[PDB]
Design an enzyme around this catalytic site. Structure first.
Site, short mmCIF file in Angstrom:
data_model
loop_
_atom_site.label_atom_id
_atom_site.label_comp_id
_atom_site.label_asym_id
_atom_site.label_seq_id
_atom_site.Cartn_x
_atom_site.Cartn_y
_atom_site.Cartn_z
N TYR B 26 96.26 -0.58 18.53
CA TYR B 26 95.73 -0.46 19.87
C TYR B 26 95.05 0.84 20.14
O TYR B 26 95.59 1.89 19.82
CB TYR B 26 96.88 -0.55 20.85
CG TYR B 26 97.92 0.51 20.81
CD1 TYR B 26 98.66 0.76 19.67
CD2 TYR B 26 98.19 1.25 21.92
CE1 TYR B 26 99.61 1.74 19.65
CE2 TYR B 26 99.14 2.21 21.91
CZ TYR B 26 99.85 2.46 20.77
OH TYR B 26 100.80 3.44 20.77
N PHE B 36 93.35 7.79 25.88
CA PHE B 36 94.56 8.51 25.71
C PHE B 36 95.23 8.39 24.36
O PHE B 36 95.58 9.40 23.78
CB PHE B 36 95.52 8.33 26.88
CG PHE B 36 95.89 6.93 27.19
CD1 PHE B 36 95.02 6.10 27.86
CD2 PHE B 36 97.14 6.47 26.90
CE1 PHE B 36 95.38 4.82 28.18
CE2 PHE B 36 97.51 5.19 27.21
CZ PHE B 36 96.62 4.36 27.85
N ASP B 37 95.39 7.20 23.83
CA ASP B 37 96.12 7.01 22.59
C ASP B 37 95.49 6.00 21.69
O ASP B 37 94.88 5.06 22.17
CB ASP B 37 97.55 6.63 22.89
CG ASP B 37 97.88 5.26 22.48
OD1 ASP B 37 98.38 5.10 21.36
OD2 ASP B 37 97.64 4.36 23.30
N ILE B 56 105.60 -1.19 28.56
CA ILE B 56 105.41 -1.66 29.92
C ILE B 56 105.22 -3.17 29.93
O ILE B 56 104.69 -3.76 28.98
CB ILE B 56 104.22 -0.93 30.56
CG1 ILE B 56 102.96 -1.20 29.71
CG2 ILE B 56 104.52 0.54 30.64
CD1 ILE B 56 101.69 -0.71 30.36
N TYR B 82 102.31 1.79 33.96
CA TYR B 82 103.28 2.85 34.21
C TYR B 82 103.60 2.98 35.69
O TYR B 82 104.76 3.12 36.08
CB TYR B 82 102.77 4.18 33.66
CG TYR B 82 102.99 4.30 32.19
CD1 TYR B 82 103.56 5.43 31.67
CD2 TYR B 82 102.61 3.30 31.33
CE1 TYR B 82 103.77 5.55 30.33
CE2 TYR B 82 102.80 3.42 29.99
CZ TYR B 82 103.38 4.55 29.49
OH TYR B 82 103.60 4.70 28.15
N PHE B 99 93.09 -1.51 27.48
CA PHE B 99 93.69 -1.43 26.15
C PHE B 99 92.90 -2.30 25.19
O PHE B 99 92.94 -3.53 25.29
CB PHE B 99 95.14 -1.88 26.20
CG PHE B 99 96.09 -0.80 26.50
CD1 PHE B 99 96.19 0.29 25.67
CD2 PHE B 99 96.89 -0.87 27.60
CE1 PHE B 99 97.07 1.29 25.95
CE2 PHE B 99 97.78 0.13 27.88
CZ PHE B 99 97.87 1.21 27.06
#
Lengths: 115, 107, 896
Positions: B26, B36-37, B56, B82, B99
């Site tokens: 992902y 972010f990631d 989540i 979140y 995502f």
């Protein structure tokens, strides 16, 4: 050798001066009294790269050294010997890596191995 | 809720289920465009098992709708994300997450 | 606030050299249809998803310099309003990712025959992926310049760029009325893939450092000839035109004699059967009429062009008569030979100076006839389709057919001159090519500022492949990329096309170089001299000197630089491997000079001068412009006045100063759809305000006040509100009932001339913005204007004004509020979102638009392959090796 003889004999230089000035030779179109415009210097000025090419890197030290010796004005024989004994002196320039590329180039010449 | 944007079609026969381990690569982003990631930067696929709420709730539902070998793009609204607190230092409060996931293998 | 980084793939685009467009009476067809068949594409060769988009672009503006542009880099096809891209799931343009629905949509995969289109009749760009129409069309896009097809790829792709006919054979079929894309190439060149705006080409011995490349313009396809009304019948012209026509008609007859066919008396013209040697009068009255007209109108073009046909010493006998030869006897339809011998006289080059453009004002006028009739240029003879292979101006016409036109005019003028007439071409005076290309003609490649040498005899080489305006030499580290080399004091260079040392001007020096001329640059800092060796020989000045410049103060230092002009390529061999240097031993080694990159085992990084105008802060010492902070009293608000220092004197420079404030305003990610300040309103409002006071003496018809998105890269010296990017991404839910039409642009302003020596007073223009609803409105001295813009969420907007000075007091930004509308300081900063008092912190600065700035050349460029894959498969791009930078994103400017 001609140049070296010229730089020693003052009468030679003064004669060059008198000749160039009195016969009204331009010394300018010759370039195409000023010592630089005199062909005496110009010959060696243009021929110098060949001579320096005749000497590999490892020798320039001795050159200055011999240049040093010519401050004393050691005889041709005297400088010759004072560089003969210093055979160990020139060389080992691997210790001077800045000379490596010059070394490689003068090797890559049509000049053969270290003869 | 979550959405399924089929970036590339997978299989469509098999789907993740209860008690199965899903692996994903992902890469993720905020709604403005910041990222972010990414698993892909870490170089290791991400593992989780549909059911025990590792992640989540939204991510879990989104990966549950998907097929095998199907890249997609989930859009988890804050409530299934979140939420109001946000991950401190990473996700600002009340932010919507997007995502780019890819369900690689189902074991 | 904190600078941001990421790892981003390189993206690089390849176009074919097809260029099309539209203009007034242009000679180019409208519809164009080309396909791209993907053959294999890895999805995730690196962290980034593999980049691949298809679309068209615009000639002037699509400059995707490898590296980082806007956003997070990767400016492929459609990351600017000059391009219009597509991805299978999106319709990219202006760095936005608006989606789109096509049956069974899926990102670009193997065996996807993307059938792009373009009809510029409206303007429109439609697609058909794999046969299913893409339910989204661009429209209203600008039409200045030329549109070329272009794909954009990252590493690990393969695409076949089908082009109709024998260059790819159209898996699918062009919609009715559409055209293949191969019939758009000019005869003067051939078809080949090529990149866009390359500054580096890997070559046999190494990189090439190509300079600027000159492209066509949308006009150059339309002809601009002289007319056939404004000329009359002068006396001697009336005397001689009859003889001229009499000779030239039969010469034209004899030109095609026995060539296509042997004469048959069945036809007297138009099908290769037209000798009529004895009699051209009885020939069709229109035909002989325009034969006499060829002679006349030819002389008439000479008059309009501007000769003075005047006789000289009379020639009544120089052994002149029509030579009788057995070959081409043809008693039938005229035995008198067309050519009367003309050996006793010739034609000087001046009449040729006339003859070439005579052939122009022939060909181009016929083309202006056909295009007015309906025809258009092509590469395949289409008779009933009214399209031909030579409907271009004289410039772009094939060499041989140009020579044929010149042969017709050669025989005409050969008949003519022999009468002592003083035909002469008035010379034609050059001028500046255009105002915007002042900087778009040079690229200045220098090494890094960290290699500044300040001692030691250094040397390098620069093999000037072509002889053009290219110069090479040493330069000081603070080299201005805006002025050419040597005009300032920061450059000691050597131009080749003339042969001219350059510093604070030009001086004669040496000889011009030809091709393959290594120009060895040296520097002897201990003696403070610079020497240049053109092919070994030391370039001697126009004097006894040897070094080019003497007494060069060591100063900050020097470093190599080379300016390369249009079409000009080169090779900067700083010589990491000395053997690769070609002339170092001949000159530069026996003297104490070391090569520049003698031990820099890693190649010397080079920086060039981009031609992508980015906004830059006002220099605190500018020659002309002067920004003055002015804190606001109880009545006036804080205001950043702008003043023109040098007005009304020598070097009172005037030009549009594209100004822009530093920090933007950002709209809300979700829109709201579904005396004194009243507390609640001014606490919950979202409308923000600023204004620009254009003073007296600054004609309101010379300012443009408004906003600019962070991708405004348009330094236009003839600016107006018609030279601003625009597009409308019309998305339809089906063939009918289209359900969304977003209007996108890169500049939102109003022209003060709308609101306005009928009067002479100060004028104020306000700009409201409703961040929640996206609407934007402009106020004019109290009234409400008619303009209003509606922008989509997350949009960033810089306050900006574009002014052409006409006074030493041009404008004044006025950061203030109104009743129940917060000022700009509420938006730009976060800690003042609830402060209704106007503020102007030092970070809010004025910034103009600098057209050129330095930038880095990546030490590793992509490697793409281009090749005709086969007669039936078309051309074939291919890229395989991954390559990533680590970009640095400045969040406020949306720049990396």
């Amino acid at each position: 050798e001609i140049f070296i003889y010229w730089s020693k004999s003052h009468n030679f230089k003064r004669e060059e001066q008198n000749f160039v000035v009195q016969n009204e030779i331009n010394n300018m179109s010759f370039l195409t009294y000023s010592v630089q415009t005199s062909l005496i210097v110009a010959t060696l000025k243009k021929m110098l790269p060949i001579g320096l090419n005749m000497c590999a890197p490892t020798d320039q030290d001795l050159i200055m050294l011999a240049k040093t010796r010519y401050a004393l004005k050691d005889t041709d024989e005297e400088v010759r010997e004072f560089l003969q004994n210093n055979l160990h002196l020139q060389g080992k320039v691997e210790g001077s890596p800045s000379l490596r590329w010059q070394m490689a180039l003068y090797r890559g010449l049509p000049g053969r191995e270290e003869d | 809720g979550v959405e399924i944007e089929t970036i590339s079609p997978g299989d469509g026969r098999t789907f993740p289920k209860k008690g199965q381990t899903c692996v994903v690569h992902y890469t993720g982003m905020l709604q403005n465009g910041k990222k972010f990631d990414s698993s892909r930067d870490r170089n290791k696929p991400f593992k989780f098992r549909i059911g025990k709420q590792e992640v989540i709730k939204g991510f879990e539902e989104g990966a549950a709708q998907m097929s095998l070998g199907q890249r997609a793009k989930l859009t988890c609204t804050p409530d299934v994300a979140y939420g109001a607190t946000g991950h401190p230092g990473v996700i600002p409060p009340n932010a919507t997450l997007i995502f780019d996931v890819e369900l690689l293998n189902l074991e | 606030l904190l600078l941001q980084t990421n790892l981003i793939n390189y993206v690089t685009s390849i176009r074919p050299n097809i260029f099309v467009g539209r203009a007034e009476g242009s000679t180019q067809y409208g519809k164009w249809y080309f396909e791209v068949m993907v053959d294999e594409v890895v999805p995730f060769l690196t962290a980034q998803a593999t980049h691949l988009r298809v679309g068209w672009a615009l000639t002037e503006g699509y400059s995707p310099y490898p590296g980082g542009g806007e956003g997070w880099g990767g400016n492929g096809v459609g990351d600017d309003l000059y391009s219009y891209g597509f991805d299978g799931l999106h319709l990219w343009t202006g760095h936005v990712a608006r989606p789109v629905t096509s049956p069974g949509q899926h990102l670009l995969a193997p065996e996807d025959v993307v059938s792009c289109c373009l009809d510029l009749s409206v303007p429109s760009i439609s697609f058909r992926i794999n046969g299913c129409p893409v339910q989204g069309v661009f429209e209203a896009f600008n039409l200045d310049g030329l549109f070329f097809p272009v794909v954009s790829f990252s590493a690990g792709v393969k695409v076949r760029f089908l082009l109709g006919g024998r260059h790819g054979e159209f898996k699918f079929l062009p919609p009715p009325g559409y055209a293949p894309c191969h019939e758009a190439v000019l005869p003067r060149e051939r078809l080949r893939l090529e990149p866009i705006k390359e500054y580096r080409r890997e070559g046999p011995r190494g990189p090439h450092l190509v300079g600027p490349s000159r492209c066509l313009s949308h006009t150059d396809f339309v002809p601009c000839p002289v007319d056939t009304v404004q000329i009359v019948l002068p006396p001697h012209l009336e005397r001689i035109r009859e003889k001229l026509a009499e000779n030239i008609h039969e010469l034209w007859a004899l030109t095609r004699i026995e060539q296509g066919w042997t004469y048959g008396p069945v036809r007297d013209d138009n099908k290769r059967l037209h000798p009529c040697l004895v009699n051209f009068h009885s020939l069709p009255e229109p035909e002989r009429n325009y034969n006499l007209q060829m002679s006349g109108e030819t002389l008439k073009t000479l008059l309009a062009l501007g000769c003075h046909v005047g006789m000289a010493d009379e020639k009544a006998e120089d052994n002149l008569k029509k030579t009788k030869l057995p070959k081409t006897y043809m008693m039938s339809n005229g035995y008198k030979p067309a050519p009367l011998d003309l050996s006793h006289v010739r034609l000087t080059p001046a009449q040729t100076t006339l003859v070439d453009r005579l052939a122009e004002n022939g060909h181009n006028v016929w083309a202006r006839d056909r295009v007015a009739q309906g025809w258009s240029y092509s590469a395949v003879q289409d008779i009933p389709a009214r399209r031909n292979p030579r409907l271009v101006p004289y410039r772009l016409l094939d060499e041989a057919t140009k020579r044929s036109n010149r042969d017709s005019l050669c025989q005409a003028v050969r008949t003519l001159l022999g009468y002592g007439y003083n035909i002469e071409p008035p010379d034609q005076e050059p001028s500046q090519v255009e105002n915007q290309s002042r900087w778009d003609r040079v690229r200045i490649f220098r090494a890094e500022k960290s290699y500044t040498v300040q001692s030691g005899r250094w040397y390098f080489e620069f093999e000037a492949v072509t002889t053009g305006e290219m110069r090479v030499g040493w330069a000081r580290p603070e080299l201005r990329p805006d002025v050419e080399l040597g005009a300032d004091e920061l450059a000691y260079v050597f131009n080749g096309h003339r042969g001219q040392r350059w510093h604070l001007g030009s001086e004669p020096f040496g000889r011009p170089w030809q091709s393959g001329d290594v120009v060895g640059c040296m520097i002897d800092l201990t003696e403070n001299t610079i020497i240049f060796t053109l092919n070994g020989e030391v370039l001697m000045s126009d004097s006894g000197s040897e070094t080019a410049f003497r007494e060069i103060e060591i100063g900050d230092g020097f470093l190599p630089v080379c300016s390369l002009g249009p079409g000009q390529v080169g090779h900067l061999n700083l010589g990491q491997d000395v053997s690769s240097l070609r002339f170092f031993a001949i000159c530069g080694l026996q003297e104490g000079f070391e090569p520049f990159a003698i031990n820099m085992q890693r190649p010397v990084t080079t920086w060039f001068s981009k031609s992508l105008p980015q906004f830059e802060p006002v220099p605190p010492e500018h020659p002309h412009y002067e920004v003055a902070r002015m804190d606001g009293t109880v009545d006036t608000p804080p205001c950043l006045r702008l003043a023109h220092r040098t007005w009304g004197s020598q070097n009172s420079l005037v030009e549009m100063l594209f100004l822009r404030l530093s920090l933007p305003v950002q709209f809300h990610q979700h829109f709201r759809c579904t005396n004194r300040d009243d507390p609640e309103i001014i606490l919950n409002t979202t409308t923000y305000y600023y204004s620009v006071r254009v003073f007296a003496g600054q004609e309101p018809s010379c300012v443009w006040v408004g906003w600019v998105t962070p991708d405004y890269h348009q330094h236009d010296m003839n600016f107006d509100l018609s030279k601003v990017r625009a597009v409308t991404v019309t998305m339809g839910d089906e063939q009918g009932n289209v359900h969304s039409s977003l209007k996108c642009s890169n500049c939102y302003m109003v022209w003060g001339g709308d609101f306005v020596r009928i009067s002479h007073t100060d004028l104020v223009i306000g700009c409201l913005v409703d961040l929640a609803t996206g609407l934007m409105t402009f106020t004019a001295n109290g009234k409400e204007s008619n303009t209003f813009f509606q922008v989509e969420p997350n949009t960033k907007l810089f306050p900006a004004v574009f002014v052409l000075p006409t006074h030493q007091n041009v404008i004044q930004f006025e950061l203030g509020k109104q009743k129940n509308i917060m000022p700009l300081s509420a938006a730009m900063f976060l800690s003042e979102r609830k402060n209704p008092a106007p503020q102007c912190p030092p970070r809010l600065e004025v910034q103009m638009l600098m057209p050129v700035s330095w930038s880095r050349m990546p030490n590793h460029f992509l490697q793409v392959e281009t090749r005709r894959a086969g007669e039936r498969l078309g051309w074939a791009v291919q890229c395989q090796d991954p390559l990533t930078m680590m970009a640095l994103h400045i969040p406020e400017e949306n720049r990396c």
